[PDB]
């Protein structure tokens, strides 16, 4: 049998909208584009 695995946090960014995983932050934000909400700035206005 085998044993031994180190858990590192190299990919702290993980898009929880489509199912992806990046390394840097700039990459995530640039990908968040497609996942743009509807008028985020301000209240719900509903």
Binding site for Zn ion (CB under 5 A): 15, 17-18, 20
- Report in angstroms how near the CB of residue 9 gets to Zn ion at its nearest: 19
- Report in angstroms how near the CB of residue 16 gets to Zn ion at its nearest: 8
Kindly tell me which of 13 and 15 has the beta carbon lying closer to Zn ion: 15
Backbone angles phi, psi at 25, to 5 degrees: -80, -45
Measured in Å, how far apart are the chain's first and last C-alpha atoms?
A: 59
- Report in angstroms how near the CB of residue 29 gets to Zn ion at its nearest: 11
- Separation of alpha carbons 46 and 7, rounded Å: 44
């Amino acid at each position: 049998g085998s044993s031994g695995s180190s858990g590192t946090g190299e990919k702290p960014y993980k898009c929880n909208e489509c199912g992806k995983a990046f390394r840097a932050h700039s990459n995530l934000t640039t990908h968040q584009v497609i996942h743009t909400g509807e008028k985020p700035s301000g209240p719900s206005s509903g």
